[PDB]
Amino acid sequence: APVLTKTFVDRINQLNGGMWKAVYNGKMQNITFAEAKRLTGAWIQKTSSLPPVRFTEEQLRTELPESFDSAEKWPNCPTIREIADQSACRASWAVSTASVISDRYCTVGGVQQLRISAAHLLSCCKQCGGGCKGGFPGFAWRYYVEYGIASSYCQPYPFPHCENFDTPKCQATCTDKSIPLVKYRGSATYLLLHGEEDYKRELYFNGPFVAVFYVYTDLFAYKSGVYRHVDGDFLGGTAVKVVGWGKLNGTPYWKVANTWDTDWGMDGYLLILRGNNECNIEHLGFAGTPET
């Protein structure tokens, strides 16, 4: 039932040539297949119909840096650096989107510290998915524009750290009933469809965005370095927040915030190979704009 064994981890480090380091004695040492499936479930609708991004001429003419990090461009935006823990609810579709929306209130929306509620999104957007069963990030972005989402102050995340439970009921009131519920809406949502240069230009001007990529079992052993899939079973798709790009010992990467708490990866982060649509990470990004 184990996803990881010592033999599997040895084979992984043989096939990856040392580009990244796989470990057996980490956070996922004993995770099973049924538990690993709790961490995917981000779904994509091949049609969509969301509009593509539109850059201005001044933005297109802007020369982009060799490395970039969102937290370095917006050092007064604390939510950019906060790593979430989705727990054992198939919720990355909501947690990543809510995390990006919170960052953009600071980078684009003129609000320095507004944390948006992933619990509200996953429990009250019934058209987005099946709550803790899974969901579409694209539908979550539409819901933000159409209906709006409560803040974490009003509806904090209810699931705890592990080593889980049902979709919470949708509530029109805050968990603390003395606190009134305020909904926050977007004005627009749009897609990044042309890969690496779209990603870089959107990050540079507007900050983090959501991308989905393919999850294989060798990812659960990732400790450090620049990840790329070399072996193991396909498990599905997961949604992550992209925050930057750079190079590590010659190898280009995207810097990505996972939702598996800070005891996985590089303090919660994943560095994934950049340049050749690794594990489909460059195929499609989601972003949007807060009302002002």
Side-chain angles (χ1 to χ4, degrees), residues 3-273:
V3 169
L4 298 182
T5 66
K6 176 188 175 57
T7 299
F8 181 47
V9 167
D10 285 345
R11 172 179 230 253
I12 289 171
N13 292 306
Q14 282 181 34
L15 290 164
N16 67 30
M19 180 179 293
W20 54 282
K21 182 184 178 177
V23 303
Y24 177 67
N25 296 302
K27 171 204 174 84
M28 303 299 197
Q29 172 178 24
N30 290 324
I31 198 173
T32 65
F33 269 92
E35 294 157 6
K37 297 293 301 199
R38 297 294 179 111
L39 306 183
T40 54
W43 303 323
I44 294 292
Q45 177 214 15
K46 171 142 272 152
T47 88
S48 184
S49 84
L50 285 174
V53 61
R54 291 305 163 207
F55 298 109
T56 72
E57 174 183 346
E58 173 163 44
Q59 298 180 133
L60 294 162
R61 299 201 180 269
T62 294
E63 203 218 319
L64 300 178
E66 219 43 58
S67 297
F68 178 83
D69 190 42
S70 287
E72 292 178 348
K73 179 151 173 169
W74 295 278
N76 303 326
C77 291
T79 60
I80 295 180
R81 302 182 172 94
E82 299 174 332
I83 290 284
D85 187 359
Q86 74 181 77
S87 191
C89 166
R90 316 223 299 156
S92 70
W93 64 273
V95 175
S96 291
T97 298
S99 171
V100 162
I101 291 167
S102 307
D103 294 347
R104 296 219 162 195
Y105 269 102
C106 193
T107 62
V108 158
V111 187
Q112 168 159 37
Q113 288 200 54
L114 180 54
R115 293 160 176 92
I116 299 298
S117 172
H120 181 251
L121 182 51
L122 72 80
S123 76
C124 289
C125 183
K126 272 83 164 62
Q127 61 257 64
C128 288
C132 288
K133 296 172 165 59
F136 297 82
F139 292 164
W141 274 99
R142 272 196 166 107
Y143 186 86
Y144 172 53
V145 179
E146 314 178 305
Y147 297 99
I149 306 167
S151 64
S152 307
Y153 183 58
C154 177
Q155 287 187 8
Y157 200 69
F159 303 118
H161 305 308
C162 292
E163 260 198 17
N164 212 261
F165 271 95
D166 324 311
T167 303
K169 166 124 82 67
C170 175
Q171 292 286 122
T173 55
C174 303
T175 303
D176 181 348
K177 294 291 182 282
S178 69
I179 301 174
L181 186 153
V182 180
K183 286 186 183 185
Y184 297 91
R185 285 171 71 129
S187 60
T189 180
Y190 51 86
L191 306 165
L192 314 174
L193 301 164
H194 301 127
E196 171 172 10
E197 295 309 310
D198 267 3
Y199 285 17
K200 280 180 183 189
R201 202 166 304 272
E202 176 74 11
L203 280 162
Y204 183 81
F205 288 105
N206 295 328
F209 65 91
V210 176
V212 184
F213 76 110
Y214 292 149
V215 171
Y216 293 86
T217 55
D218 63 347
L219 181 64
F220 288 80
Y222 167 86
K223 182 61 172 187
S224 64
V226 178
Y227 174 81
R228 63 180 184 91
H229 163 64
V230 300
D231 194 32
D233 302 272
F234 176 72
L235 293 170
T238 198
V240 297
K241 162 168 88 177
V242 188
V243 301
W245 70 89
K247 276 183 185 177
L248 179 63
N249 306 322
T251 299
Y253 63 83
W254 303 103
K255 182 167 183 191
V256 152
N258 215 346
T259 54
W260 303 347
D261 203 6
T262 53
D263 55 339
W264 177 91
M266 301 171 80
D267 300 324
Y269 291 94
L270 166 72
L271 312 188
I272 178 170
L273 187 63

